[PDB]
Design a protein around this motif. Structure first.
Motif, PDB file in Angstrom:
ATOM      1  N   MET A  14       0.948  -1.349   0.002  1.00  0.00           N
ATOM      2  CA  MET A  14       0.243  -0.141  -0.015  1.00  0.00           C
ATOM      3  C   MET A  14       0.806   1.302  -0.161  1.00  0.00           C
ATOM      4  O   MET A  14       2.031   1.513   0.689  1.00  0.00           O
ATOM      5  N   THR A  15       0.424   2.091  -0.641  1.00  0.00           N
ATOM      6  CA  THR A  15       0.728   3.660  -0.795  1.00  0.00           C
ATOM      7  C   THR A  15       0.458   4.542   0.500  1.00  0.00           C
ATOM      8  O   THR A  15      -0.320   3.794   1.210  1.00  0.00           O
ATOM      9  N   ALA A  16       1.128   5.439   0.745  1.00  0.00           N
ATOM     10  CA  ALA A  16       0.982   6.382   1.742  1.00  0.00           C
ATOM     11  C   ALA A  16      -0.547   6.978   1.658  1.00  0.00           C
ATOM     12  O   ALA A  16      -1.347   6.913   2.674  1.00  0.00           O
ATOM     13  N   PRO A  17      -0.938   7.719   0.332  1.00  0.00           N
ATOM     14  CA  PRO A  17      -2.365   7.982   0.290  1.00  0.00           C
ATOM     15  C   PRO A  17      -3.449   7.040   0.744  1.00  0.00           C
ATOM     16  O   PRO A  17      -4.354   7.070   1.211  1.00  0.00           O
ATOM     17  N   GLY A  49       3.068   8.297  10.904  1.00  0.00           N
ATOM     18  CA  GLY A  49       3.824   7.188  10.365  1.00  0.00           C
ATOM     19  C   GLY A  49       4.406   7.487   9.106  1.00  0.00           C
ATOM     20  O   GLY A  49       4.499   8.629   8.531  1.00  0.00           O
ATOM     21  N   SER A  50       5.011   6.482   8.271  1.00  0.00           N
ATOM     22  CA  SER A  50       5.723   6.729   7.066  1.00  0.00           C
ATOM     23  C   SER A  50       5.583   5.306   6.263  1.00  0.00           C
ATOM     24  O   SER A  50       5.370   4.366   6.929  1.00  0.00           O
ATOM     25  N   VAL A  51       5.913   5.702   5.264  1.00  0.00           N
ATOM     26  CA  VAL A  51       6.255   4.344   4.215  1.00  0.00           C
ATOM     27  C   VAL A  51       7.736   3.930   4.553  1.00  0.00           C
ATOM     28  O   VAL A  51       8.685   4.797   4.608  1.00  0.00           O
ATOM     29  N   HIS A 109       6.003  -1.360   2.284  1.00  0.00           N
ATOM     30  CA  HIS A 109       5.155  -1.527   3.487  1.00  0.00           C
ATOM     31  C   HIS A 109       5.138   0.062   4.146  1.00  0.00           C
ATOM     32  O   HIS A 109       6.259   0.677   4.199  1.00  0.00           O
ATOM     33  N   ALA A 110       3.980   0.343   4.452  1.00  0.00           N
ATOM     34  CA  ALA A 110       3.719   1.532   5.350  1.00  0.00           C
ATOM     35  C   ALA A 110       3.102   1.231   6.602  1.00  0.00           C
ATOM     36  O   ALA A 110       2.444   0.327   6.769  1.00  0.00           O
ATOM     37  N   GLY A 111       3.169   2.468   7.560  1.00  0.00           N
ATOM     38  CA  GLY A 111       2.483   2.066   8.678  1.00  0.00           C
ATOM     39  C   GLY A 111       2.328   3.473   9.313  1.00  0.00           C
ATOM     40  O   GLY A 111       2.332   4.407   8.666  1.00  0.00           O
ATOM     41  N   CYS A 140      -0.829 -10.397  -4.575  1.00  0.00           N
ATOM     42  CA  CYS A 140       0.348  -9.913  -4.239  1.00  0.00           C
ATOM     43  C   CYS A 140       0.843 -10.904  -3.197  1.00  0.00           C
ATOM     44  O   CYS A 140       0.260 -11.295  -2.303  1.00  0.00           O
ATOM     45  N   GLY A 141       2.032 -11.619  -3.288  1.00  0.00           N
ATOM     46  CA  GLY A 141       2.570 -12.430  -2.412  1.00  0.00           C
ATOM     47  C   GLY A 141       3.958 -12.843  -2.844  1.00  0.00           C
ATOM     48  O   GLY A 141       4.562 -12.212  -3.336  1.00  0.00           O
ATOM     49  N   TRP A 142       4.621 -14.197  -2.451  1.00  0.00           N
ATOM     50  CA  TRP A 142       5.761 -14.419  -2.694  1.00  0.00           C
ATOM     51  C   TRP A 142       5.902 -15.957  -3.410  1.00  0.00           C
ATOM     52  O   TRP A 142       4.786 -16.476  -3.526  1.00  0.00           O
ATOM     53  N   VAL A 143       6.881 -16.186  -3.943  1.00  0.00           N
ATOM     54  CA  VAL A 143       7.158 -17.322  -4.615  1.00  0.00           C
ATOM     55  C   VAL A 143       7.385 -18.538  -3.549  1.00  0.00           C
ATOM     56  O   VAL A 143       8.166 -18.365  -2.901  1.00  0.00           O
ATOM     57  N   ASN A 144       6.811 -19.377  -3.303  1.00  0.00           N
ATOM     58  CA  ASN A 144       6.826 -20.551  -2.273  1.00  0.00           C
ATOM     59  C   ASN A 144       7.758 -21.833  -2.947  1.00  0.00           C
ATOM     60  O   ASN A 144       8.343 -22.149  -2.238  1.00  0.00           O
ATOM     61  N   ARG A 145       7.232 -22.050  -4.286  1.00  0.00           N
ATOM     62  CA  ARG A 145       7.964 -22.945  -5.116  1.00  0.00           C
ATOM     63  C   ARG A 145       8.041 -22.818  -6.258  1.00  0.00           C
ATOM     64  O   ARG A 145       6.815 -22.028  -6.755  1.00  0.00           O
ATOM     65  N   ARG A 146       8.745 -22.878  -7.219  1.00  0.00           N
ATOM     66  CA  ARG A 146       8.647 -22.911  -8.718  1.00  0.00           C
ATOM     67  C   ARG A 146       9.039 -24.139  -9.607  1.00  0.00           C
ATOM     68  O   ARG A 146      10.065 -25.120  -8.971  1.00  0.00           O
TER      69      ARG A 146
END
Ligand SMILES: [Mg+2]
Ligand SMILES: [Mg+2]
Lengths: 590, 590, 148
Positions: A239-242, A486-488, A528-530, B21-27
């Motif tokens: 996610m973006t900051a906006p 917070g910030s990105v 990642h932003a928080g 949106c995610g990660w590669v777990n296995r290919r």
């Protein structure tokens, strides 16, 4: 075992037999009749004891304030002439049939028909919490956290706990150390916040995290500053900051609609620069319509040292404050202000009375008119859009002193001249903060923190001109208070290394202090932003209170002490020897 | 910006285009076709890159383990022969039409198809928490605390925070000290729990309190024992023990329904006395059907000392363990157990093989039948209800020796002979725990905190015969694990004094260990009672793990060290300087 | 013990500096191949005698350093201390060093039986051999538990 709470009873209950548990609030004899205002967390209900039931009336004549009692009785309509429109239960009373004195009570050392010192109240905190005004604050605090939690849940943030026994890390600020009995000579640190742990969780796959957690700042305690405070900690991925501000702006509107029942509208959005140029602070109170104006550029060639100086100073500014109807000010008046700004380290407070721009210089009166001239004064008025009957104060000094003092005089003149509407809500987003701030010791410090991403500057450019780098950081201000921010974060290792560099921490230190962080950024770190919220301030704002200690069950004094338990105190001498430590003199050893 | 979470795709999503949106777990590759197990917090989904163009592909051939990528594609059914039973999404796959590699990933230092020390996983915790098996336990913990909160808030409990910085020299001198920068030489203590504050909040009239809160122990970090642990903390007013147990029971039941979908059903209730007798434990595992039978009175007159003595001794017992289908047991096996019980103090393990009761002494086979007789063995087979095939083991020693030995023997045998259905949920309540006990040198010490009330005694009867007085305390056991406990506190001051008298805690002691509290009891103290569930245990049970570290995101090792952040650490001298403390060491003759 | 009297790690330090205690190392030949499961069992086996645990050091490539070993306690120790142990115990590549840190009696009881177990479980103990010996200089007395 109650059947109902004293304060919930309404006309709708008329007829039922109820069992009340609670305390004697007041007592009033009316002939042979005994009346008790019985109390419990829901409120007060009038209890009537009739002589028809000899034993309950017998015991009832011993009731004094605060006695812990139980009464089973019948709810009934009060007569029209006895209705008390100011009690929620004002239309009924309970005709008792039975009474049991669970416990008598000593006379309270905290007088109630009179006002007490926050001090005496804090020593008998338990007693002071029996008051409705007080207990309602904690009940709304419970309500708020509850409205928050349901919100985060509906939006998919997982509540994941982070450790309280942390590692003392570099920069940021000051921690509370905790010696170890297992690793003699080593400490942990109470967390200032789950700051690095929540980012580590975004790298662990959890996608949205939140926690209502305790944070500890061992810096000196200001006004509404406790050593411990509670934050609504939030962290997001992909996610973006906006986007982050959007949902975060939703949680707050939701709170203000559910709690005070107000709608806030889309929060306006200001940059750090605008906020400072116009109000002298990074947490403006938009309840006050006034705003500062800059004129240094107009005063570079003046003879007058009070302007020329700060106007030719790279780190200076001459801010003008047009205060409507200000011409009407008196000498004693103008002087308090003049002295007022001194408090914030400013010099004086030049001024111009604009009585009639229809007379050029002749339409204005001023201790400094002779220093400026026909042209310069016209531009100053135009630039300030001065009105006839307007006063114009000037703060000329160091940028920080002017912002500090002029933004203060701006607020004070607001209440005085009755220009600020204390009744309104002014929420907003201050964004585009700088990455660093001069640290007064040669280097730079993170405005927000070391892991804040720069809006659009590259690692190289950041190495080139760090002082000018803009941050992907945002604060939520409401009425002049920083409620959250917070910030990105930085999701790239070279970038993170670079900032640690500018921050003056070397490879070796980076390795040993942020090594786990520097390695984790190598494994597909997601953007990642928080943002963290000030729960206490939020509750203060929502319970319409100005005393932060009024929203905490058991707060500490400004000196970080607990008058009710008497901590801090001396530790068992033995305890220290087991911890392999000992207290010393500030001078003595070294 | 995702449109859905990988692991939530199902047959009902077919035809829907998605963005993940995610990660590669296995290919895996099929020629030029690239198959990838794309993972995110909800789980894994198979994504296939099958463009009929060499342009589009490129990116995909670059993907590797833990690459953070964004792909948007359409859902479809996996061909019947490739549908994966063990995968929530195993009946579908996603055909990618777009690929964006958000961030690469170095080669993982953690091995996937190899064995990793819990040491490495702990050092790379953010890597280990990515494992779906690991994410899930923490996702469930979040659902558990969410369920608790909503349940508590609905049943009227108020979430009210208590302080972490607290009064030192609190309980057992088993706490962490936090030195004060402001009050040189003074310390606060991290809390074992909101021990005294929840009782204060009952005095303050809040009526029901709860909090999901951290606690600290400082003993020798046993395994399964972290330096800090979360508790679901509860306190109530105007409720009896049974009424406290009922609501806390509806909580657990609610947790099992909503999480495991099982209906735990009404909880059995037992007395500390019945538990030790029947199970030889104060935390009975009722997944095991066996039980111990006292048969002392049946053997008080035999000549055999092994039985006659422990049988006649007032502080000794003769327990019979009937193990269904045990006669069919080996000398070898009967010798292991013979040994096994030695580990807890047993001198031996007599036994009676029951082959055919109907036939009498000729129906049994036992090395001690000689020293007994027909009647005694008949009475015993009756009491224990021995069926042909059953084995009767006997532990005849001191109440403690027998309890731990047979207690343990019962558990082992049950597992061995497959008699215990490890898959059954066996909750229960153990109550009426003794009030006192011998401490170090004897005298008497509280089994629970000193503010616990007697179950069925008068201040005088208690002062008169405290040794075996029974407490009004309770425990919740689930499959042999204390998961919660609590008790009814004292509200009658005469009684509190007598406890203290029995306890040897004189006036000066009382006043410094808990003076504010004792003071608090002077103002109409209501009847109050509470309890605390260990959240970690609860979560272990609910996610079938046995390792406490699997339910905590950032756990410490047994040595209380954190392998990732590397805490605890040496403190900066500067910091120790402001804190007015210093590390020292016995300067033993040098 | 004398090798660890310094360390901040109280688990070792306490008993190494405590004259009524001791830090005992047990070297098991080629026991490095021992398993996660096997170590844990032993971990609990020692408890039977009063032990609060069993620290270990798996010796892989000796002449390679703290890099050559593998141990949960290695970080509470350092380079110098670990060579002294591997040397003293004359550890060898693939060897396993187990640690008993408590009061003399517990260490004796735990590491003594542990020493026996590991021997049978790994058949390092040749029971076809005859091992006679004399044990002399027994204490004169024993604690009576009741003071005398
Ligand atoms: Mg701030
Ligand atoms: Mg217990």
């Amino acid at each position: 075992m109650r059947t109902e709470y004293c304060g919930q009873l309404r006309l709708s209950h008329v007829g039922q037999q109820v069992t009340l548990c609670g305390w004697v609030n007041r007592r009033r004899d009316l002939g042979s009749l005994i009346f008790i205002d019985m109390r419990d967390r829901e409120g007060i209900v009038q209890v009537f004891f009739d002589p028809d039931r000899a034993d309950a009336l017998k015991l009832a004549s011993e009731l004094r304030n605060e006695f812990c009692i139980q009464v089973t009785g019948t709810v009934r309509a009060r007569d029209e002439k006895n209705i008390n429109r100011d009690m929620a239960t004002g239309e009924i009373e309970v005709l008792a049939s039975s009474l049991t004195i669970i416990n008598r009570a000593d006379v309270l050392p905290l007088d109630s028909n009179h006002v007490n010192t926050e001090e005496a109240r804090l020593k008998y905190r338990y007693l002071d919490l029996r008051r409705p005004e007080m207990a309602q604050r904690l009940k709304t605090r419970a309500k708020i956290t509850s409205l928050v939690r349901r919100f985060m849940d509906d939006h998919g943030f997982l509540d994941i706990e982070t450790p309280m026994l942390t590692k003392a890390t570099p920069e940021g600020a000051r921690d509370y150390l905790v010696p170890s009995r297992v690793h003699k000579g080593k400490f942990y640190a109470l967390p200032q916040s789950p700051q690095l742990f929540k980012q580590l969780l975004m790298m662990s796959g959890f996608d949205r995290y939140y926690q209502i957690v305790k944070c500890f700042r061992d810096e000196d305690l200001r006004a509404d500053r406790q050593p411990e405070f509670t934050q609504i900690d939030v962290e997001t991925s992909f996610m973006t900051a906006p986007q982050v501000r959007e949902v975060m702006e939703a949680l707050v509107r939701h709170l203000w609609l559910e709690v005070k029942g107000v709608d806030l509208g889309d929060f306006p959005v200001m940059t750090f620069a605008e906020a400072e140029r116009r109000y002298g602070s990074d947490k403006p109170d938009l309840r006050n319509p006034m705003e500062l104006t800059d004129v240094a550029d107009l005063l570079k060639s003046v003879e007058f040292a009070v302007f020329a100086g700060p106007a030719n100073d790279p780190k200076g500014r001459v801010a003008a404050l047009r205060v409507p109807g200000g011409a009407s000010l008196t000498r004693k008046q103008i002087d308090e202000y003049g002295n007022f700004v001194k408090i914030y380290g400013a010099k004086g407070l030049a001024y111009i009375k604009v009585n009639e721009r229809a007379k050029g210089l002749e339409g204005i009166n001023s201790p400094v008119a002779k220093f400026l001239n026909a042209e310069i004064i016209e531009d100053i008025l135009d630039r300030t859009a001065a009105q006839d009957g307007d006063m114009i104060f000037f703060g000329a000094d160091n940028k920080k002193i002017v912002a500090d003092a002029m933004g203060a005089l701006r607020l004070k003149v607001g209440k005085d001249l009755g220009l600020t509407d204390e009744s309104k809500w002014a929420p907003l987003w201050v964004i585009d903060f700088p990455m660093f701030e001069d640290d007064g010791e040669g280097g730079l410090t993170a405005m927000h923190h070391p892991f804040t991403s720069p809006k659009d500057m590259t690692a190289a450019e950041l190495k080139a001109a760090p002082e000018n780098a803009v941050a992907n950081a945002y604060d939520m201000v409401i009425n002049g208070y920083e409620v959250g921010g917070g910030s990105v974060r930085i999701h790239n290792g070279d970038m993170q290394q670079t900032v640690f560099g500018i921050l003056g921490i070397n490879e070796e230190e980076q390795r040993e202090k942020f090594g786990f962080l520097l390695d984790a950024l190598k494994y597909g770190t997601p953007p990642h932003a928080g943002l963290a919220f000030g729960l206490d301030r939020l509750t203060m704002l929502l319970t319409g209170t100005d005393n932060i200690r009024d929203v905490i069950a058991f707060p500490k004094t400004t000196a970080a002490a607990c008058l009710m338990t008497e901590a801090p105190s001396f530790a068992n001498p033995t305890a220290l020897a087991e911890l392999s430590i000992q207290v010393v003199k500030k001078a003595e050893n070294n």
